[PDB]
Symmetry: C6
Subunit: 192 residues, 6 copies
């Protein structure tokens, strides 16, 4: 683990070291050591005021098609890949940190992909969960529930706090990446 952090650390620019702390210290550690157990009882303590068998199963599924923690884990995997794909290609090309030559296209594309992956996952969070605040009460009318059934979410306030934290840090990583693009564009295209 130290080698992986050190290996990525030694092959990054000035801001590329700041970006690595924001990813490991906050996105990963908070997801692992603080937020994973907040969502542990997400369906166990989902409570619906009904006597209909199977009503709770389909109402929880309707309102949480994918868990927040599963969405964040997918985002972290998608974002860490370009940062390490450029390293694996570097080892291959070297076998056969300033930016020059062919590495310029790979590094710039990797920065571009992370911005796209960041914004896409942030947009999925907003659209799917119609905001970043979790409600105490959800009203569900999917079959087999009769009419509209009241259901109550487990730990809505604590999940809102961690949702705001994850979204805000993701926005910071967006700003740090578009800034790095500006520096590369100034040095290369505006440098001419």
């Amino acid at each position: 683990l130290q080698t992986i952090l050190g290996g990525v650390n030694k092959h990054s620019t000035s801001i590329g070291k700041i970006w690595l702390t924001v990813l490991f210290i906050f996105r990963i550690m908070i997801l692992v050591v603080a937020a994973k157990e907040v969502w542990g009882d997400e369906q166990a303590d989902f409570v619906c005021n009904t006597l209909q068998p199977g009503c709770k199963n389909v109402c929880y599924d309707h309102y949480f098609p994918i868990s927040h923690i599963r969405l964040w884990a997918l985002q972290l995997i998608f974002v860490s890949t370009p940062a390490l794909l450029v390293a694996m290609h570097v080892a291959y090309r070297r076998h056969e940190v300033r930016i020059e030559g062919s590495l310029w296209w790979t590094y710039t594309s990797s920065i571009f992909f992370r911005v796209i992956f960041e914004a896409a996952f942030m947009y999925v969070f907003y659209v799917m969960y119609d905001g970043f605040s979790m409600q105490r009460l959800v009203k569900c009318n999917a079959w087999p529930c009769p009419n509209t059934v009241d259901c109550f979410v487990s730990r809505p306030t604590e999940k809102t706090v961690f949702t705001v934290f994850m979204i805000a840090v993701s926005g910071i990583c967006i700003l740090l990446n578009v800034t790095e693009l500006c520096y590369l564009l100034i040095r290369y295209c505006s440098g001419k």
Copy 2:
């Protein structure tokens, strides 16, 4: 784990680097980090509208003869085996260019991976009549009286991860197929 990956990563060709990345970061990490706890309550939260004792047991067993995550773990072990068999056999002969007797092993090893990957993709489709999980399963196996209604836990999340794994597996098939294109053009056309 880091040492094991380093051995496989070093002894690979140009495409084999991309294939190794797709295998570890996607097949393994999603299965371990994100998919494993989705299937945690597959039978605990399986709910059947009945009063018949034992009806839930036979009904869950009918519609899920093997879990999705258990089927994916078997696929990973079978796919990862030819890669490590090549390394073990190569180290034995010592006691990346492809030439000599190692050519027959490498070409065969990739061929097995396509067979294993497509076979497990076929079993997924046949056993689960598609890649989309349903909310409701109807059930008439003994001792369930007539047809009973049963409800699946987290069907939408399970579909999302199923679609992801099938799509990534399809990518791995194409990468292995293109290897046989760059190996037969070197041999048959040369």
Copy 3:
């Protein structure tokens, strides 16, 4: 773990190594060895005297918007971040423990940030939980609970003991950090 502790402790001053012992041995170890499993049944054995569905969910959420251990985990991440940020920037300059030059500004700011983070989290603990004692009984009247219902907290006394222990150690870490600022401000501002 040994390398990370070995890396941080080497690049530290006299008191700054005492501060590392109070952080690792007491804040981290108490949190993960003892305190974490004290809070494991926090909502499972939250008991409310009522027959209203969903009333337990909203009353627990009202009185524990975020768990104590989750608050402490976030505090430890924030407090330890400036120390590691200094280490990462130090390697940046060397590839490009007396305090001199421009390293003075980074070290002094890192100490200042840690005091602010420590006091902020200590302030949030007091405001959110109206003191450092956990009560046996909470009275809750949030919807959909009818009138006011009686709810009972799990292990309030053990949680009070660990809450006092964490606050006291955090206050000690504040005192050590303030002392270090006094030493540095003697050299520079009092020197003039």
Copy 4:
């Protein structure tokens, strides 16, 4: 992990290295990462159609005197012991100096065949075959007359049982092959 596997790998014959992969990657991995959790709810989800207290306890105990995964773990420990003994004895033999190897190596292979066959035999006799039934009928005290009990995940347990039995049979053939190679050179080679 890497060191223990690496140590046993370096001191082995041509076939014996094929035996190492078929033991670790398949016996241990399927047992650890796929099969152990399948048996996790074996008694929790065991359901008996009765109102008699204590009837579920004795019926499960009657039909599962020892769990499949516990039986496989014991077999893996016993099968891997002769290889462990050889390495420990070989290190001691080197220290004493600071033919004989042939006798220990042949005997270790012999014990592995006996241990594999004995455990495979116990699986057959104890569970009257390799297929798990959905319904067991139990009349042990204190169950009144005969009660119906339902097994948890019988189909998934059958799939893994068939898998471990088949891999074990392959191991027996590999050890027999190595046993014949040594016999032909020494006894028939006179």
Copy 5:
């Protein structure tokens, strides 16, 4: 000797191996599925406590810890004497220590083996336990979880423990044969 290191350490690793990867999960549900035919609150708590004052696996864990110490105490005494002599520079004494540690291991192995027999009046676990401790009214029938699997692992641990007694005794008599001769 050959039995002194190879056989004794392998049997020790075997006992640890059984305890962790096999035995621990067998006892994980000992009180959860302890079932008593009664309606008396607290009756199940005191009946389980009466018949299982300490769990089998917890007793085995104490055995393996106590059996390990005489060897470890020998190493500390041996290493300290060598280093202290080496630093000062900058057999006969060991023999009375080595034979003592072997003697202690026999004593510990037999003492724990005897405790197993007396505490559980045998090595076979029963399906049914009859309990009459307060507050249970009259005698209450209670049912043990997985008694057959627990008997199989008990036999495995006892038999391996008894072999270690014979191996330790064999080495002890071997030294005392030479010492007298």
Copy 6:
């Protein structure tokens, strides 16, 4: 882990290595491999003969204000702290027999270990009125009506492990005290 164990093992006196083996193999290993699973169901299997909601919660809290394993975990951290702090203070001077300035720190570290062990042993006695756990506790705290009967989980096993930890701690106190005599007899002879 071997670095931590090796570090303390290397820098210790003749008796200081005996105290080290009785702390790891017995205090730590038994707390980790045997004791923590004994206390796992301490409140889940705590049973009270009542129909009053919340009565079980306050009765368990009254009679077990802090768990035995949590009290032991705190004691181990406090007892092991001075032994480590010697190394950190020693390594500080090294990169910048007992004699010199080390004599005052080592003697003080021994002194704190005895005080911490005695304080925690005293807390165990005062808080839990002896070292034997009872099967039945009578509780009358609000909201329990009158006095209710509550039954502890695994009281005999907990008593067995409680006796073992107290006995080993008393052995540790004697070992620390005997090292307080070897150091003091040398200076007393000098006086």
